Design a protein around this ligand. Sequence first.
Ligand SMILES: [Cl-]
Ligand SMILES: [Cl-]
Ligand SMILES: [Cl-]
Ligand SMILES: [Cl-]
Ligand SMILES: [Cl-]
Ligand SMILES: [Cl-]
Ligand SMILES: [Cl-]
Ligand SMILES: [Mg+2]
Ligand SMILES: [Mg+2]
Ligand SMILES: [Mg+2]
Ligand SMILES: [Mg+2]
Ligand SMILES: [Mg+2]
Ligand SMILES: [Mg+2]
Ligand SMILES: [Mg+2]
Ligand SMILES: [Mg+2]
Ligand SMILES: [Mg+2]
Ligand SMILES: [Mg+2]
Ligand SMILES: [Mg+2]
Ligand code: NA
Ligand code: NA
Ligand code: NA
Ligand code: NA
Ligand code: NA
Ligand code: NA
Ligand code: NA
Ligand code: NA
Ligand code: NA
Ligand SMILES: [Sr+2]
Ligand SMILES: [Sr+2]
Ligand SMILES: [Sr+2]
Ligand SMILES: [Sr+2]
Ligand SMILES: [Sr+2]
Ligand SMILES: [Sr+2]
Ligand SMILES: [Sr+2]
Ligand SMILES: [Sr+2]
Ligand SMILES: [Sr+2]
Ligand SMILES: [Sr+2]
Lengths: 142, 150, 142
Amino acid sequence: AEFDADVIVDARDCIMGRVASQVAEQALDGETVAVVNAERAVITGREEQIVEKYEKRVDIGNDNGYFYPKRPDGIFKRTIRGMLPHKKQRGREAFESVRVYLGNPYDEDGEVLDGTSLDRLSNIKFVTLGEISETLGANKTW
Amino acid sequence: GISYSVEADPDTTAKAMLRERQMSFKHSKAIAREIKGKTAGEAVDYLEAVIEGDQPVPFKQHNSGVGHKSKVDGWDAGRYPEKASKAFLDLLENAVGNADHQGFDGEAMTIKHVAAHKVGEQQGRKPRAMGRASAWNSPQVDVELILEEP
Amino acid sequence: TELQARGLTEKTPDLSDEDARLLTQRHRVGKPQFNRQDHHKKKRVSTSWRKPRGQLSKQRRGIKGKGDTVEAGFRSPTAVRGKHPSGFEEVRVHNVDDLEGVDGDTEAVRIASKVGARKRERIEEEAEDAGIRVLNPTYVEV
RNA sequence: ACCCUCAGAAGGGAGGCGAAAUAGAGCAUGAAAUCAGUUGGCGAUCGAGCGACAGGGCAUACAAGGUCCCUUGACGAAUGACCGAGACGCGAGUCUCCAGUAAGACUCACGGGAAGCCGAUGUUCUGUCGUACGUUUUGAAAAACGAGCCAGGGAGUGUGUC
RNA sequence: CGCUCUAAUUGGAUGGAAGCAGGGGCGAGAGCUCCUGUGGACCGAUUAGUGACGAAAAUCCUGGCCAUAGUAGCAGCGAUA
Ligand SMILES: [Cl-]
Ligand SMILES: [Cl-]
Ligand SMILES: [Cl-]
Ligand SMILES: [Cl-]
Ligand SMILES: [Cl-]
Ligand SMILES: [Cl-]
Ligand SMILES: [Cl-]
Ligand SMILES: [Mg+2]
Ligand SMILES: [Mg+2]
Ligand SMILES: [Mg+2]
Ligand SMILES: [Mg+2]
Ligand SMILES: [Mg+2]
Ligand SMILES: [Mg+2]
Ligand SMILES: [Mg+2]
Ligand SMILES: [Mg+2]
Ligand SMILES: [Mg+2]
Ligand SMILES: [Mg+2]
Ligand SMILES: [Mg+2]
Ligand code: NA
Ligand code: NA
Ligand code: NA
Ligand code: NA
Ligand code: NA
Ligand code: NA
Ligand code: NA
Ligand code: NA
Ligand code: NA
Ligand SMILES: [Sr+2]
Ligand SMILES: [Sr+2]
Ligand SMILES: [Sr+2]
Ligand SMILES: [Sr+2]
Ligand SMILES: [Sr+2]
Ligand SMILES: [Sr+2]
Ligand SMILES: [Sr+2]
Ligand SMILES: [Sr+2]
Ligand SMILES: [Sr+2]
Ligand SMILES: [Sr+2]
């Protein structure tokens, strides 16, 4: 379905938390943001420990529940929510005006935000969001 | 007792009241609530269907433990309070009777206002175990009715 | 055909530059409600002020948000304290002989509630003739 | 009283008396807790000392309050620039001049505007702060003690001596 | 600051007192005061007195009232009617 975005961000080879922090800041300023190519988004560090943290979040829960997303679609969306006061009116409106996508459903190419890009030629210790999702058990639909 | 809580123009209106009725007040709120807006004749047919058990009265406020009824629309709980329905029929017999005497078409008149008020309790006492006694009271109900021309 | 008030209703006093400055200050600054602690929490506890005596009382200890405690620092300016919002000093009147000595430029008059329609009519006409405004006038059909 | 209704000396309706029946029989007045109906505000995706202070929505017969908004201008405490020019710094940036200038809370004046309009009141939304009250206690939101709610009642008094 | 009754001085009320309900104004505040409705006969102020004079609390007292709830009971017994 259509979503009229003011800003379209390209998450490809970009440090997740840094994109997320900027997308949150913009959503609270009234912008309708759309994060694109989230499967190709990046997160630094040793893969074994990163996956361990995300696997623990999946195993955590009870009857009240702890719904933790396995797909890179929802993982990026949850990362943004943690940077937004989603329980408050202004915060929920900001969050609901942000959507994360697998690939690029638009004709326009996304913009790469400043300070978010990771130089692959300078880094080897990082993981792609899709690689985390495959290890978590999600169905590769990208 | 009570007095009519709503203004009424005598030229286009018929009135009626019930005094110190020993019936359930909780049932009376539910019946009043449901018959309001209906025509006097529609209300008589409705209350007769309740006594027969063919039409349930929605219990929206006093419903703790009340089982669900399929015929209740927009709500779930309901019952068939015959005692208070028979008393409301006496109120509608009086109202339509007062109406016809004034030259109106009683049955066809709209129920503009209908409300039940708890006027008191007929005190009672029930012996319990351990040499103690507790209350066993009967509610005393008043109910006003204002019929109006369509 | 319509209702009209007796006397000089639209009359305003002549105050010095300083007394008008202080009157405008009292009106701007205002003061807090000064209602008793937790009056809103319990019906048996009225709005009337009582000093919070409790050793652990949040209001007594001056916790922010628990309401202002009565202090002398809250007093209105001496030069304007007790004046009617118009700027007039009030004089309570019971009869016609109570209007004597009243300066209609500085003071306005307030007829006591008990005083009946007969005596009120005589007080009102004698007040208008003496150039004194009646704060609580009779509204006659003119 | 009369009439209608009703199983009816009930009750109800209409009617009569009286200044007043909302003075109609435990019948002067008629508070609160609280109940029925109803009005305003909120409301079935959202968080809990229930508020105080700020600021917005919606709501308001009169009376007892009459203020309030916007251009501009005057005054102008502490504070206090942009731009530009000159000069330093690896750099972020800084010093000098412009300048204690423009600005600067309050208050006032001219012109224009508002009367649900300003205040105020009801409710609700946003911001800030906020785990009752009283008592016990070194330490009470306390998993320490008391209260279901309201009204009324409820605790330094007398004599003698010093 | 407020309450009771006494006194002196001095006022208000059937052209509507006290009380009560809702509302306006003042006082840092105790509280004062006005408007409207109700009520239908009493009510103040100042000064000097008087005191069975002020409540949110005491598992406080008495009365009234809500939720609990249209819920438990109206079955169980060698007499199942
Ligand atoms: Cl779970
Ligand atoms: Cl939040
Ligand atoms: Cl690396
Ligand atoms: Cl009941
Ligand atoms: Cl003082
Ligand atoms: Cl000023
Ligand atoms: Cl003492
Ligand atoms: Mg049941
Ligand atoms: Mg016994
Ligand atoms: Mg209260
Ligand atoms: Mg009475
Ligand atoms: Mg201890
Ligand atoms: Mg005197
Ligand atoms: Mg008392
Ligand atoms: Mg105490
Ligand atoms: Mg008791
Ligand atoms: Mg139960
Ligand atoms: Mg048998
Ligand atoms: Na990490
Ligand atoms: Na989980
Ligand atoms: Na149904
Ligand atoms: Na249905
Ligand atoms: Na408001
Ligand atoms: Na204690
Ligand atoms: Na405590
Ligand atoms: Na505790
Ligand atoms: Na009880
Ligand atoms: Sr940012
Ligand atoms: Sr219920
Ligand atoms: Sr009066
Ligand atoms: Sr009558
Ligand atoms: Sr929380
Ligand atoms: Sr200056
Ligand atoms: Sr009432
Ligand atoms: Sr006492
Ligand atoms: Sr009960
Ligand atoms: Sr049996």
